[PDB]
Design a binder for these strands. Structure first.
Ligand code: MG
Ligand code: MG
Ligand code: MG
Length: 1034
RNA sequence: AGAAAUCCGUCUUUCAUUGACGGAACAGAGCAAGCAGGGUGACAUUAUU
DNA sequence: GCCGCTTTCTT
DNA sequence: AATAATGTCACCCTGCTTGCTCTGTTGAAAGCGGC
DNA sequence: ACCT
């Protein structure tokens, strides 16, 4: 079938005063009718029955909890604006049972027992339904009968059966002739009859078309008139009659569609309360208008259905969580675990929830073993495990909690202790968990056929200024209630460029006139002569280029064949323009010649991509079950130029050290004048001269943006113990750093490091405000106070955060663009990406969590997911586990194959940290990836013939005076490699080098290491290859 | 149908009226975390009496 | 053919 | 032993800040009468 | 496990 995607444009409307008033009144009208339908539909959904739900969910393959669907429609947490019949949560269960005829299910119990925010209140929508029946002056059974018709006609969304657009307005309040349903039902039933018992199932549809025409007593030219009275969109049966006749016949499918029609049309639409309901709606809104009532209904109905569905799923989830909690609730082990706070191993003012990560997690087991194996030295076992654990990502255990656990290890096993910690976390999260309130929301309203078509646009073009206006033609409601259409303009140079400007190209047709869709605008020259206001130049430039393209006759004509464009408008005048377009036919599974890629997301280094082809002959891959060939690997990059020099906006690290001496000098003059205040001995004040820290920062010659982050921290430290006078002087320095020369307000790339730098600068200003206003636990400060004290610098807080927000949005867009453009250029139809990456969690260090917040792994994946189907490129998510260590084309071909990662360190640069890592890795044989790094250390010693060192290398702990020095390893390696500048391969986690069996990374070179031929590859390119080769779902 | 308008943004000790460039959007609810001060509380290294 | 309205469509 | 420097780790608070998921929307396709 |  033909796949499609959606692009869109967003601007603000510019109506004159009179039309602005009309638009304001029309939107207010639509909004008030929306609130009315919201309350009325809340009432009507309060009125559904178990048997309506049963009928709507009946063909569902998984059985639905009908009682729970009833519940999520009968009782809703709601806002004060729709609260009509307050119910205490106490009574929820009881009242539900009264309505349901039986005991409330456990999932329903979880839904009722869940928390709600303070501005929300439980509302009994079934009582609201009864009172609505009274207001309408109809019997309850009558309105319920009409509700059954509505839910059968798909006019309302019930459970898993979605609504049929806005059809409710036409079906219930429409003024026109309707279908002859009995005719369609008879014809459909006999057609299913006739095709039920065929003694020869034809391969083509011609005999079946014969049968249908004979039953319907019509010809191919009269079937529509006979069957549907020439009314409505063509049915499946009409289009079956329309088919060629040599086309193949799917008997199963025709029977399925005919059964659908018999099921949906067996009961007629005989309303009981139609005219009451129409009078009610019209009195509470405006005189009947299909479009306007449709918009009101759409807003209200969407708002209600999304929350009912979410609460259904949430209640099921909550029941599962509750059963998991009550399962591992070992009363005694939990109680003694928490008795840690009531024991003298804790002297804190307050307690806190004990979690798995506070215990070391699984490794608590190991610790118990130590205690079994060497009692009466428990402190050393604790210290050894803690040192072995320490990870730059995971949060370290609480030493006293482990100390107290030793006390009770005879009574409480390791597994029961970790079960108890898991129970603590799960119960806490279960208790704060909140049900979802039904609220109208602030969605806008859509006018259909609102944009004047580009080829019909009124254009007041000048020789040097194209008419840049796009006009909507909208029906608006006047004070007398009359609807009239008015022209309202808006500007969008991107919508102008991509679609709306009048193309004149003799030979070119494209979908969107922008580079990623294959079109580039002409270059501006010395003849361009742009003379506009300063605040329009960029827009002017785009206009100029389009003008040039029209003058050259090279502006492509849009091939989208747009016949109507709709516009969605809100109360603030903003307009949204959706454009749907076809992207090609749906792809089949991998053929030979199909190309696919994978991408690896990195933080400090570039995202990597790896490009592969399915081949007829070549290297076989089991998991793909095909032959594959490596095309190429690379770094994801987004270059822009400054007078010929290139910059990767994604990775640029700013000026090298020697190139910003002046800037550094200025910072230097400041720090020589100041000192850091510190008072954590007693209340006595300790002074250190800031230059000490500044020299330390400048010692290892960082590049510009790292330097700026480090200097931001320094400034914050300088600001900490000062007085107001001092702060006034310091305020002058803070402004110079932020605003001039190399400050984040003029320089900084889209790199993660730059975002962290801007965050550190915000930290400076935050510390300024905290110290100035004497902040404390008993004296919290607010934004009101901060703004009153120093409005300008408080404004800089928001400005810096907006800078970060804009950087991050632009960055996500640019990463997706670079990868998609790589795919288009290398004819890639499939992308694999890690859909698995961590966001943030209590078990992770706050520094790593903050970095991950600025990393935006999920956002990047979502953006690639958004852009890929716009070029018929499929994106698959895959689990990220072990993708950095698998050996490409060897792992799962046929067996599991993994290796450590390596770094290329010059021998002179081999410091005590290398020994730390080497020692740790060697004495680190364990489950998971440690085994591969222990193996890598083994191979390292073998290759460099340093095995004699292994022994003492294993006794290496940090700070031991009898540790082997760096000069030892450096001198052996320089003995063997000849000099001090030759590289040494070291196994280190996160290293950028992978020793691959195969040449699976562009630019790899083969060496022999530990008597093994192996390709020295970029580790992230290896990871991208691993991701590309994965087939398993996430 | 009313000549005005950066649609929204990015890079650069380069800030550009011919510099180089990028983007489907929107609503509500929910969840997860971060920071600046301030408190608590454990450990570890130095360097001494 | 267009506009503005109706209806049904099982995608 | 014991004091005090400097660093690590964690746990809490007030009042702000952020990213991510969920469940949805931005209709399709035909005829009619009046232009 | 990703992430260094
Ligand atoms: Mg990865
Ligand atoms: Mg700038
Ligand atoms: Mg990687």
């Amino acid at each position: 079938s033909m796949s499609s995607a959606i692009k869109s444009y967003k601007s603000v409307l510019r109506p004159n005063e009179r039309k602005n008033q009309l638009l304001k009144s029309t939107i207010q009208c639509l909004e008030d009718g929306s609130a009315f339908f919201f309350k009325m539909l809340q009432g009507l959904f309060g009125g559904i029955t178990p048997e309506i739900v049963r009928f709507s969910t009946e063909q569902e393959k998984q059985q639905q909890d009908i009682a729970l669907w009833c519940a999520v429609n009968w009782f809703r947490p709601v806002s004060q604006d729709s609260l009509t019949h307050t119910i205490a949560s106490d009574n929820l269960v009881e009242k539900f049972e009264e309505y349901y005829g039986g005991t409330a299910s456990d999932a329903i119990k979880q839904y009722f027992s869940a928390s709600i925010g303070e501005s929300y209140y439980w509302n009994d929508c079934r009582q609201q339904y009864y009172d609505l029946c009274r207001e309408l002056g109809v019997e309850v059974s009558d309105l319920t009968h009409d509700l059954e018709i509505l839910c059968r006609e798909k006019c309302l969304a019930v459970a898993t059966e979605s609504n049929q657009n806005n059809s409710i307005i036409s079906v219930l309040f429409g003024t026109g002739e309707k279908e002859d349903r009995s005719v369609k039902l008879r014809i459909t039933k006999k057609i299913l009859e006739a095709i039920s018992n065929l003694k020869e199932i034809p391969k083509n549809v011609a005999p079946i078309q014969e049968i249908i025409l004979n039953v319907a007593k019509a010809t191919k030219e009269t079937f529509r008139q006979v069957y549907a009275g020439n009314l409505g969109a063509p049915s499946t049966l009409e289009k079956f009659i329309a088919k060629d006749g040599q086309k193949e016949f799917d008997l199963k499918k025709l029977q399925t569609d005919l059964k659908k029609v018999i099921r949906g049309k067996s009961k007629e639409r005989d309303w009981c309360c139609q005219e009451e309901l129409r009078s009610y709606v019209e009195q509470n809104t405006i005189q009947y208008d299909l479009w306007a009532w449709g918009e009101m209904f759409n807003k209200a109905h969407t708002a209600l259905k999304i929350k009912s569905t979410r609460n259904y799923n949430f209640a099921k989830q909550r029941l599962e969580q509750f059963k998991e909690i009550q399962s591992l609730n070992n009363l005694l082990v939990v109680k003694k675990l928490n008795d840690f706070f009531d024991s003298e191993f804790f002297s804190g003012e307050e307690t806190y929830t004990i979690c798995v990560h506070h215990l070391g997690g699984k490794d608590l087991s190991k610790l118990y073993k130590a205690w079994e194996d060497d009692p009466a030295d428990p402190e050393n076992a604790i210290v050894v495990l803690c040192d072995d654990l320490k990870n730059n990502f995971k949060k370290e255990p609480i030493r006293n909690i482990l100390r107290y656990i030793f006390t009770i290890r005879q009574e409480c096993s390791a597994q029961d202790i970790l079960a108890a910690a898991k129970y603590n976390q799960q119960l806490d999260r279960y208790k704060s968990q909140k049900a979802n309130p039904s609220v109208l929301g602030n969605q806008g309203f859509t006018w259909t056929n609102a944009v004047i078509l580009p080829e019909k646009a009124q254009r007041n073009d000048r020789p040097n200024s194209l008419d840049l206006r796009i006009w909507l033609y909208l029906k608006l409601r006047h004070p007398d209630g009359r609807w009239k259409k008015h022209h309202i303009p808006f500007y969008d140079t991107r919508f102008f460029q991509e679609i709306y400007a009048a193309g004149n190209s003799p030979v070119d047709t494209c979908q969107f006139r922008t580079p990623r869709f294959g079109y580039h605008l002409p270059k501006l020259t010395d003849q361009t002569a742009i003379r506009v206001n300063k605040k329009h130049v960029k827009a002017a430039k785009t206009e100029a280029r389009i003008r040039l393209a029209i003058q050259q006759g090279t502006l492509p004509v849009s091939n989208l064949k747009i016949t109507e464009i709709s516009a969605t408008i809100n109360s603030k005048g903003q307009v949204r323009i959706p454009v749907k377009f076809d992207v090609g036919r749906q792809k089949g599974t991998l053929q030979i010649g199909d190309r696919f890629c994978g991408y690896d997301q990195n933080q400090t280094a570039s995202h990597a991509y790896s490009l592969w082809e399915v081949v007829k002959e070549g290297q076989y891959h089991k998991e793909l079950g095909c032959f594959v060939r490596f095309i190429s690997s690379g770094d994801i990059v987004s270059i822009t130029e400054n007078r010929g020099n290139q910059f990767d906006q994604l990775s640029y690290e700013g000026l090298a050290y020697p190139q910003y001496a002046d800037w550094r000098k200025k910072a230097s003059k400041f720090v020589s004048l100041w000192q850091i205040t510190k008072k954590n001995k007693k209340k006595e004040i300790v002074t250190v001269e800031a230059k000490e820290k500044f020299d330390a920062i400048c010692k290892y010659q960082p590049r510009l943006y790292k330097f700026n982050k480090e200097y931001a921290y320094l400034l914050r430290d300088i600001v900490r113990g000062k007085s107001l006078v001092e702060l006034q002087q310091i305020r002058q320095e803070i402004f110079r750093f932020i605003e001039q020369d190399c400050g984040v307000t003029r320089l900084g790339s889209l790199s993660l490091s730059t975002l962290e730098t801007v965050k550190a600068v915000k930290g400076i200003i935050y510390s300024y405000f905290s110290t100035a206003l004497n902040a404390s636990k008993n004296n919290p400060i607010s934004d009101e106070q901060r703004k009153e004290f120093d409005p300008e610098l408080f404004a800089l807080l928001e400005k810096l955060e907006l800078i970060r927000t804009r950087k991050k949005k632009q960055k996500v867009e640019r990463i997706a663009n670079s990868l998609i453009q790589t795919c288009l250029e290398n004819n890639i139809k499939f992308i694999r990406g890690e859909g698995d990456l961590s966001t943030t969690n209590n078990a992770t260090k706050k520094k790593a969590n903050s970095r991950s917040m600025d990393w935006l792994a999920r956002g990047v994946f979502n953006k690639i997911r958004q852009l890929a189907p716009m070029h018929n490129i499929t994106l698959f998510g895959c689990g990220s586990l072990y993708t950095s260590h698998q050996d490409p084309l060897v792992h799962r071909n046929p067996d599991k194959a993994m290796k450590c990662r390596w770094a290329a360190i010059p021998v002179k640069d081999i410091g005590d940290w290398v020994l730390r890592k080497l020692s740790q890795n060697l004495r680190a044989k364990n489950i998971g990836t440690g085994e591969y790094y222990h193996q890598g250390v083994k191979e390292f010693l073998s290759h460099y013939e340093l095995q004699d060192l292994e022994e003492e290398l294993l006794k290496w702990r940090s700070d031991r005076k009898s540790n082997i020095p760096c000069w030892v390893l450096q001198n052996r390696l320089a003995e063997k490699l000849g000099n001090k500048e030759a590289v040494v391969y070291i196994p280190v986690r996160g290293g950028r080098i992978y020793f691959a069996t195969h040449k699976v990374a562009t630019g790899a070179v083969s060496i022999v290491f530990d008597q093994k031929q192996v390709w020295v590859c970029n580790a992230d390119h290896v990871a991208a290859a691993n991701i590309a080769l994965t087939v398993k779902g996430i």
